[PDB]
Every structure is written in C-alpha cells, then in structure tokens.
A paper describes a structure:
The active-site cavity is further subdivided into two distinct faces consisting of hydrophilic and hydrophobic residues.
In this study, we investigate one of the most challenging cases and describe the subtle effects brought on by a Val143 to Ile (V143I) mutation. Structural analysis was performed by comparing the catalytic intermediate states of native and V143I CA II, which were obtained by cryocooling protein crystals under four different CO2 pressures [ranging from 0 (no CO2 pressurization) to 15 atm]. On the other hand, the active site of V143I CA II shows noteworthy modifications. Finally, the two intermediate waters WI and WI′ show different behaviour in V143I CA II. The intermediate water WI is visible even in 0 atm V143I CA II but is not present in 0 atm native CA II [Figs. 2(a) and 2(e)]. Among the five WEC waters in V143I CA II, WEC2 is located close to the mutated residue Ile143. Indeed, the WEC1 to WEC4 waters show similar structures and dynamical motions as in native CA II, but WEC2 shows a significantly distinct behaviour. Therefore, the fact that the structures and dynamical motions of the WEC2 waters are significantly perturbed in V143I CA II is likely to account for the stabilization of W1 but the destabilization of the two intermediate waters.
Numbering used by the authors: 4 to 125, 127 to 261
Write the structure that this text describes.
Amino acid sequence: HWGYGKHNGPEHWHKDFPIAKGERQSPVDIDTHTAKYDPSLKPLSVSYDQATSLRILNNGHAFNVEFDDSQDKAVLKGGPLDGTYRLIQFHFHWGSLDGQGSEHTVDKKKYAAELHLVHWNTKYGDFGKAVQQPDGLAILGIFLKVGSAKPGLQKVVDVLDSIKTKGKSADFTNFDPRGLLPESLDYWTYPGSLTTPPLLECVTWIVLKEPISVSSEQVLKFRKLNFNGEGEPEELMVDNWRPAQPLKNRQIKASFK
Ligand SMILES: [Zn+2]
C-alpha cells in the first residue's frame, strides 16, 4: 500500500522495503561542479528504429508505455554500459506545479517532470531476473521543462483520457520514442536503484543534461490522471516523484567537459 500520499509516501517506504535506506538509492541530486568528466565513457548508442510499442497502462502510480521486448528491437548500448539493454517501458514522474516533479535534481533544481526509459540487460534473459543483478537495468532519464510543446509527446497525451484510472490500459502501437529525445546525448551516470518499490539496487542511471520542452497544456493533461480506480474518490495523479536520496559512497561521472 505504498504511494505518494500524505500517509504512504516516500518517507514511509522503508518499513516495507528496508533498502529504501540502502547504499545506492535513487534519485540523487546531481552536483554539476563535482561530477567529473570521464574521458573513458563512450557515446551512448540509443537504437530505437525498430521499437514496437504495444500498450499504455495506468498502474496507479504512473502510466507505462510498454514495448515488445521479446527481441532486440529497441536497445541501449555504449556509454557506461557493458553489453545490450532492451527497452521494456517508459513512464514519467511529474508535479502538481511546474516548479516540481522531477526525481533527479541538478544543483538542487527540480524540473517539471522526468521521463524514464527502462531497459534490461539481455545477459539476464528477461526483466524479473535482471532486477536481481547490480547491472540488471539501464534507465535513461530525461528532464522536462514547460515551454514549447513536444510534438512527439502529443499522441501520449491524447490517449490519457482513456486510461484515467488505475488498472485501465489501451492499445498503443506504433509510437516512436525517438520523438521524446533532446537534441544532445550528453549525460551524467551513476549506480543506483529503482525509484519505486521494491527500490532494488539494480540500475545504471544515465541522466541526459539537455531537457526536453513540453507545453503547459501537455503537462496539465498528465495532471488529470487519477491514482484511484474507477468509481473511487478522485485523487489526482500528481507529485508521483521520490525526492533525492543520500549519495553515500558514489561518484557521478559526466560524459562531457
Ligand atoms: Zn521512474
């Protein structure tokens, strides 16, 4: 019964998920001055040409755009990564107001939202096994700020009325996630965790520096979703972000000077 409410939110999660207080929890604040350029890092390789979106699901905490991950069709490689990681889903975290919503922060700055493209390491054969490994997942994080519209986001926004409440899904084929990427692939990277229960410490985080712009109207539509199920009291799905966690014995590396 974890969530983001007044009485089941992030500060409570440790009771059911004690790793919430672990050594490699996410998100974190990215202190840009102390992140060090690492010339050994390689460009990332984001290969989404063959991606097969299938469905969009309101799971009660966010909405997931789900992919076919039964072959290497949409893969993330390079950067800090050893080997090949399959896109399984993307989702967002966002605020009730434009001044908040991101999970990672940059010199304590909160963005309006944050996109997570979740990929699992093909060495481990599927997702459930991958989350049990320290290098099981690679999550590409992309900040959203409010300004111009993101044209490539609009098809997502327009389907949200059909998945207003927890447990609703809709067909969502032929969506191209390349339309959610910023211009630059410059990034920060560090070892961390899932940001939702079970908070497993299985993620190589790759957080892009360049945000994407979305319009006020687009984020407003995110904020019309519901945490609740159909026929239940309405609870707007807003502020579904975990705050920054202690960095502990980690270094954040930059791909760029
Ligand atoms: Zn996330």
